[PDB]
Design an enzyme around this catalytic site. Sequence first.
Site, PDB file in Angstrom:
ATOM      1  CG  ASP A   1     -12.325  70.386 -51.238  1.00  0.00           C
ATOM      2  OD1 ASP A   1     -11.514  69.455 -51.453  1.00  0.00           O
ATOM      3  OD2 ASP A   1     -12.904  71.049 -52.145  1.00  0.00           O
TER       4      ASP A   1
ATOM      5  CE  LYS B   1     -19.483  66.536 -48.125  1.00  0.00           C
ATOM      6  NZ  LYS B   1     -18.513  67.613 -48.446  1.00  0.00           N
ATOM      7  CB  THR B   2     -14.808  61.567 -48.151  1.00  0.00           C
ATOM      8  OG1 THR B   2     -15.743  62.188 -49.071  1.00  0.00           O
ATOM      9  CG2 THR B   2     -14.506  60.094 -48.560  1.00  0.00           C
TER      10      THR B   2
ATOM     11  CG  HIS C   1     -24.692  70.867 -55.518  1.00  0.00           C
ATOM     12  ND1 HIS C   1     -25.965  70.855 -56.049  1.00  0.00           N
ATOM     13  CD2 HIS C   1     -24.639  71.948 -54.698  1.00  0.00           C
ATOM     14  CE1 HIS C   1     -26.658  71.865 -55.555  1.00  0.00           C
ATOM     15  NE2 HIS C   1     -25.878  72.543 -54.730  1.00  0.00           N
TER      16      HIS C   1
HETATM   17  N1  LIG Z   1      -5.714  69.331 -42.017  1.00  0.00           N
HETATM   18  C1  LIG Z   1      -6.788  68.526 -42.131  1.00  0.00           C
HETATM   19  N2  LIG Z   1      -7.163  68.234 -43.403  1.00  0.00           N
HETATM   20  C2  LIG Z   1      -8.237  67.462 -43.585  1.00  0.00           C
HETATM   21  C3  LIG Z   1      -8.994  66.952 -42.424  1.00  0.00           C
HETATM   22  N3  LIG Z   1      -9.982  66.190 -42.929  1.00  0.00           N
HETATM   23  C4  LIG Z   1      -9.902  66.247 -44.288  1.00  0.00           C
HETATM   24  N4  LIG Z   1      -8.853  67.025 -44.663  1.00  0.00           N
HETATM   25  C5  LIG Z   1      -8.374  67.283 -46.025  1.00  0.00           C
HETATM   26  O1  LIG Z   1      -9.210  68.121 -46.802  1.00  0.00           O
HETATM   27  C6  LIG Z   1      -9.378  67.533 -48.109  1.00  0.00           C
HETATM   28  C7  LIG Z   1     -10.833  67.218 -48.374  1.00  0.00           C
HETATM   29  O2  LIG Z   1     -11.330  66.209 -47.497  1.00  0.00           O
HETATM   30  P1  LIG Z   1     -12.545  65.277 -47.976  1.00  0.00           P
HETATM   31  O3  LIG Z   1     -12.876  64.307 -46.849  1.00  0.00           O
HETATM   32  O4  LIG Z   1     -12.240  64.708 -49.346  1.00  0.00           O
HETATM   33  O5  LIG Z   1     -13.624  66.482 -48.259  1.00  0.00           O
HETATM   34  P2  LIG Z   1     -15.181  66.266 -48.653  1.00  0.00           P
HETATM   35  O6  LIG Z   1     -15.299  66.849 -50.032  1.00  0.00           O
HETATM   36  O7  LIG Z   1     -15.953  67.141 -47.664  1.00  0.00           O
HETATM   37  O8  LIG Z   1     -15.522  64.802 -48.574  1.00  0.00           O
HETATM   38  C8  LIG Z   1      -8.439  66.330 -48.188  1.00  0.00           C
HETATM   39  O9  LIG Z   1      -7.151  66.748 -48.703  1.00  0.00           O
HETATM   40  C9  LIG Z   1      -8.319  65.931 -46.744  1.00  0.00           C
HETATM   41  O10 LIG Z   1      -7.113  65.241 -46.486  1.00  0.00           O
HETATM   42  C10 LIG Z   1      -8.526  67.297 -41.061  1.00  0.00           C
HETATM   43  O11 LIG Z   1      -9.105  66.859 -40.029  1.00  0.00           O
HETATM   44  N5  LIG Z   1      -7.432  68.064 -41.006  1.00  0.00           N
HETATM   45 MG   LIG Z   2     -16.228  63.790 -50.232  1.00  0.00          MG
END
Ligand SMILES: Nc1nc2c(ncn2[C@@H]2O[C@H](COP(=O)(O)OP(=O)(O)O)[C@@H](O)[C@H]2O)c(=O)[nH]1
Ligand SMILES: [Mg+2]
Length: 365
Positions: free
Chosen positions: A14, A17-18, A57
């Site tokens: 979350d 990364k994606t 993970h």
């Molecule tokens: N406020 C904010 N939310 C973000 C940002 N980048 C990602 N998120 C949010 O955090 C959540 C997880 O992001 P994601 O890219 O799926 O996380 P991952 O599990 O690390 O790949 C999603 O609801 C995104 O929209 C950002 O720059 N700002």
């Molecule tokens: Mg991801």
Amino acid sequence: TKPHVNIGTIGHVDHGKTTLTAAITKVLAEKGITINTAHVEYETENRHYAHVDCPGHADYVKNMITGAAQMDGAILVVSAADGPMPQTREHILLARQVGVPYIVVFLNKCDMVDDEELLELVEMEVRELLSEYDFPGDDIPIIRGSALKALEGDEEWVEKIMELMDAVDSYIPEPERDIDKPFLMPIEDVFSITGRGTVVTGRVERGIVKVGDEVEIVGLRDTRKTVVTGVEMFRKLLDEGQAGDNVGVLLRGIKREDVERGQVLAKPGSIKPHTKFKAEVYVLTKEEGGRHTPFFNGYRPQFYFRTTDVTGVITLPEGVEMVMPGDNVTMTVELIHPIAMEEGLRFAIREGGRTVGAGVVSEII
Ligand SMILES: Nc1nc2c(ncn2[C@@H]2O[C@H](COP(=O)(O)OP(=O)(O)O)[C@@H](O)[C@H]2O)c(=O)[nH]1
Ligand SMILES: [Mg+2]
């Protein structure tokens, strides 16, 4: 013209990364064992990138240990709101165990965090945690951004994506090409011909072997030296053999009894034989064709290194008593015979020809 570099995002679930991966691609356009892996390719002014993001993970564990690509660098994504979280630490540790050479950090979600003093404290904490695992935390570039807001086209965040990618272009060097490395050829087969002497076949992994060059025969037995009197393929005689080539190499003053599969030829002094090492290993799941039962401190399976396998005995780290299918563990191994090896070398663990593990040498003992 354009150099290739393998990178990928790491960090806690979350943290972004994606999202960051899609921001980087959006912005730059505008300018057996199973691994779930999203691969994207993109370019800067200077370089071509192949970029992997994993969902789970297990995927990071497995991609890092038994890759496919091998990362020249990683982008550590960390939420400015949250700070480093357990998988932030785990991924740093894994990157160190498997030899990820450089890290760049993207502090994400800076759109949710006014308060410069708090951002600085989170930044300092990322720096210390990198330095715990011997990455140079003081010199690593840390960019403060918002992947979300960069995909909406918001200018200040679009520019932080460029600041990241400028940082990656400069701080993550291009991997040394295999042809510029010290010569190394693992031996597959051995033939004694009375006319000529003894030839060893295999694939040159690295560098160049030139007629008249001197080489060491490393592993299994004591390291002897010799000179190369010939390089060849099916109807070609060659003056040299380079990285990627499958050749026969003719050696002078070498009885057939004195070379075997699993030894390497190498530039003298470039690699040394070892029996004892530490490794990070991923143990396959029942479903991946591995074990369906745990193993323990005695375990004595076959280790496959380059062209051969050697029996080794596994010691578990202090406070780990068992290892289940699907775990990853740092184990210590003593093989019954020495093998040419370096940190970063990958290997398989098998028992009765069935793959139970994949690993990488993290430390030589
Ligand atoms: N406020 C904010 N939310 C973000 C940002 N980048 C990602 N998120 C949010 O955090 C959540 C997880 O992001 P994601 O890219 O799926 O996380 P991952 O599990 O690390 O790949 C999603 O609801 C995104 O929209 C950002 O720059 N700002
Ligand atoms: Mg991801």
